[PDB]
Design an enzyme around this catalytic site. Sequence first.
Site, mmCIF file in Angstrom:
data_model
loop_
_atom_site.group_PDB
_atom_site.id
_atom_site.type_symbol
_atom_site.label_atom_id
_atom_site.label_comp_id
_atom_site.label_asym_id
_atom_site.label_seq_id
_atom_site.Cartn_x
_atom_site.Cartn_y
_atom_site.Cartn_z
ATOM 1 N N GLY B 12 -110.348 0.221 15.157
ATOM 2 C CA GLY B 12 -109.353 0.413 14.638
ATOM 3 C C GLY B 12 -108.082 -0.651 14.419
ATOM 4 O O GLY B 12 -108.517 -1.618 15.209
ATOM 5 N N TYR B 16 -100.126 -2.921 16.658
ATOM 6 C CA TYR B 16 -100.472 -4.591 16.499
ATOM 7 C C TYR B 16 -101.910 -4.869 16.775
ATOM 8 O O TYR B 16 -102.487 -3.897 17.603
ATOM 9 C CB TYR B 16 -99.358 -5.498 17.337
ATOM 10 C CG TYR B 16 -99.716 -5.132 18.658
ATOM 11 C CD1 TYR B 16 -99.411 -4.266 19.390
ATOM 12 C CD2 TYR B 16 -100.453 -6.289 19.427
ATOM 13 C CE1 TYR B 16 -99.749 -4.152 20.909
ATOM 14 C CE2 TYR B 16 -100.594 -6.282 20.762
ATOM 15 C CZ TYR B 16 -100.359 -5.321 21.587
ATOM 16 O OH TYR B 16 -100.732 -5.218 22.855
ATOM 17 N N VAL B 19 -108.711 -3.673 17.062
ATOM 18 C CA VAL B 19 -109.378 -3.175 18.234
ATOM 19 C C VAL B 19 -110.827 -3.049 18.044
ATOM 20 O O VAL B 19 -111.199 -2.525 17.133
ATOM 21 C CB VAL B 19 -108.869 -1.934 18.941
ATOM 22 C CG1 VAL B 19 -109.595 -1.451 20.240
ATOM 23 C CG2 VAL B 19 -107.436 -1.899 19.028
ATOM 24 N N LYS B 34 -108.701 -5.541 22.187
ATOM 25 C CA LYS B 34 -107.535 -5.626 21.199
ATOM 26 C C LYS B 34 -107.370 -7.166 21.106
ATOM 27 O O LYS B 34 -106.935 -7.884 21.927
ATOM 28 C CB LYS B 34 -106.377 -4.844 21.874
ATOM 29 C CG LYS B 34 -105.265 -4.993 20.822
ATOM 30 C CD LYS B 34 -104.266 -3.731 21.517
ATOM 31 C CE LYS B 34 -103.284 -3.047 20.521
ATOM 32 N NZ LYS B 34 -102.585 -2.079 21.325
ATOM 33 N N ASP B 87 -111.025 9.566 19.582
ATOM 34 C CA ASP B 87 -109.630 9.936 19.413
ATOM 35 C C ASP B 87 -109.481 11.519 18.989
ATOM 36 O O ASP B 87 -110.446 11.987 18.505
ATOM 37 C CB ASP B 87 -108.857 9.080 18.535
ATOM 38 C CG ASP B 87 -108.927 9.242 17.147
ATOM 39 O OD1 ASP B 87 -109.126 10.277 16.682
ATOM 40 O OD2 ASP B 87 -108.851 8.333 16.299
ATOM 41 N N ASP B 128 -94.961 6.602 20.362
ATOM 42 C CA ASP B 128 -95.782 6.860 19.154
ATOM 43 C C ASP B 128 -96.845 7.650 19.736
ATOM 44 O O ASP B 128 -98.087 7.581 19.287
ATOM 45 C CB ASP B 128 -96.101 5.457 18.856
ATOM 46 C CG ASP B 128 -96.771 5.408 17.385
ATOM 47 O OD1 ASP B 128 -96.484 6.526 16.532
ATOM 48 O OD2 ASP B 128 -97.381 4.431 16.835
ATOM 49 N N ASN B 133 -103.530 8.120 18.962
ATOM 50 C CA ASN B 133 -103.416 7.217 20.266
ATOM 51 C C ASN B 133 -103.819 7.935 21.309
ATOM 52 O O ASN B 133 -103.550 7.534 22.345
ATOM 53 C CB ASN B 133 -101.829 7.133 20.169
ATOM 54 C CG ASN B 133 -101.564 5.941 19.059
ATOM 55 O OD1 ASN B 133 -102.304 5.409 18.239
ATOM 56 N ND2 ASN B 133 -100.214 5.908 18.786
HETATM 57 O O1 LIG Z 1 -111.415 3.208 23.429
HETATM 58 C C1 LIG Z 1 -110.540 2.921 22.580
HETATM 59 N N1 LIG Z 1 -110.699 3.159 21.475
HETATM 60 C C2 LIG Z 1 -109.555 3.229 20.559
HETATM 61 C C3 LIG Z 1 -108.455 2.491 20.802
HETATM 62 C C4 LIG Z 1 -107.490 2.327 19.687
HETATM 63 C C5 LIG Z 1 -106.607 3.646 20.112
HETATM 64 C C6 LIG Z 1 -105.333 3.081 18.862
HETATM 65 C C7 LIG Z 1 -105.535 3.085 17.751
HETATM 66 C C8 LIG Z 1 -106.567 1.873 17.477
HETATM 67 C C9 LIG Z 1 -107.854 2.098 18.439
HETATM 68 C C10 LIG Z 1 -108.344 2.028 22.179
HETATM 69 N N2 LIG Z 1 -107.460 1.331 22.777
HETATM 70 C C11 LIG Z 1 -107.911 1.054 24.058
HETATM 71 C C12 LIG Z 1 -108.927 1.448 24.314
HETATM 72 N N3 LIG Z 1 -109.428 2.108 23.015
#
Ligand SMILES: O=c1[nH]cc(C2CCCCC2)c2nccn12
Lengths: 258, 295
Positions: B12, B16, B19, B34, B87, B128, B133
């Site tokens: 996703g 910013y 990912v 990221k 999520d 947020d 999230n």
């Molecule tokens: O394991 C995961 N899966 C998804 C995300 C992101 C969460 C925010 C929206 C984009 C995707 C994630 N950030 C750290 C670990 N993560």
Amino acid sequence: VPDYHEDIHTYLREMEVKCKPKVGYMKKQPDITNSMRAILVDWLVEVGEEYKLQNETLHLAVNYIDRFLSSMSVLRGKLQLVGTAAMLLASKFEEIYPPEVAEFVYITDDTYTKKQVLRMEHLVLKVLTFDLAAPTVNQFLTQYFLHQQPANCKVESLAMFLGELSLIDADPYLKYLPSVIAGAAFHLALYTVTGQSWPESLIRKTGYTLESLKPCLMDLHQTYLKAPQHAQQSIREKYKNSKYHGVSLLNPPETLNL
Amino acid sequence: SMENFQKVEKIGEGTYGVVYKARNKLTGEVVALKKIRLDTETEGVPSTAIREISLLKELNHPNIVKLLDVIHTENKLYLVFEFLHQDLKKFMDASALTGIPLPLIKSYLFQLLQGLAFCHSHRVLHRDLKPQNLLINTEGAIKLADFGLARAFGVPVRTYTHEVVTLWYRAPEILLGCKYYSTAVDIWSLGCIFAEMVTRRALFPGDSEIDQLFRIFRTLGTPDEVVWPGVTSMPDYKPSFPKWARQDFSKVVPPLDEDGRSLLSQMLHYDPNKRISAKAALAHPFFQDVTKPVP
Ligand SMILES: O=c1[nH]cc(C2CCCCC2)c2nccn12
Ligand code: NA
């Protein structure tokens, strides 16, 4: 009070010990001195005024500089590059509207290029391992101001003035933690304006007795007395403004009666 | 070098960066990467990354996503996170017909509040909180993620960025332009999320700032000086705002018991100074029998 205020204070006290620079670092720097650092910090005060930056931003930038110089040798012609990158990083961390990199380049009068500032920003981040959320004298001061009997805008401004003067002179202020410098600043400001002393509520909150603050207080009282003679004057100019109730115009006390 | 990581798929885009799900080729560990492109960035390392990295390095907690590494390559910055398979948003969509089981709603809210109390006690505002999230694993854990809009706050606060929180989850003190906001904005968001878990639809799905406010007013009542002292002087308050009466929570969140409704009302309290804190919410009787079911 909000039920996380005490937790925040406890946590900041832990972190100020972790984010502390090496007290003797300047002796190990072959090419820079306390005087060159003073000039740099005074210059960052002026940069802050020109861009209308927060006081906290200035305090953060200084913390980053001193941590950087605790582990990296820096020649005199590069000291301002370190300081500029530090202020950029501090502005990005703390400010709603950080100035842009081209503006940081401009205030160095094109001494450095954009490429150099951006590369120094990377080096600073790497050396500090991205640990930018440092406690500052300012952070402790604002907590201490909540214990006034009652709020006095002159006392606040003066305590801020004094906490800020501490940034300029690595000798002696590197040997004290931010929470202690803040304590001394708050007591001295209080004493000067109202005649009151470091209150019992802060003795309990901080665990600092007035006696424990004395070494730092002695130093800070000298700094206050000699401020009109110091080679660096940007902080004094700044705290003449009505915004700060012109507290830098006030006569310091001659004795503390400690 | 990202030579040891194999990209598996794009997961996703958050506040910013992009990912990806990736795999460490040497250890086999599955991670979320990221990526931020720095040659696109005229201004160096963005403030969002500086804040996310510095703050997440401080926040070690079972309900906050783990930052594992930070890598600076040629013109790129990679944040390496632990991976969670989905999520809360996708999980709610997959449960739209069946419903999330009541003990799991309770467990999730309990864990979210634990994470958030830890943030607030370490002077971090998330700013947020939304289902997108909030990350869940197979074993029943939920974690806060995406600290790109987060910020270290001071005691007491000063004025911070006005443009914060995704609209549906945004507190009325921000919509009304208050000079100061703090930890209460995060609790508001979680109140919205709690309701959303219960009813399976967003509580206040506004399409503009004014529509968002009016949706809030229609459900909770248009606030006045008695309910929220100061409200009628706030910068974006207008005395022409319609005066709607408050609805009964029996209608708002039908599946919710008395304890659930008490907690929810305290999380959606108008006056931010009287809105319940994360710490106090953990002590609420709604959580007296909290368990940790597997989803
Ligand atoms: O394991 C995961 N899966 C998804 C995300 C992101 C969460 C925010 C929206 C984009 C995707 C994630 N950030 C750290 C670990 N993560
Ligand atoms: Na030296």
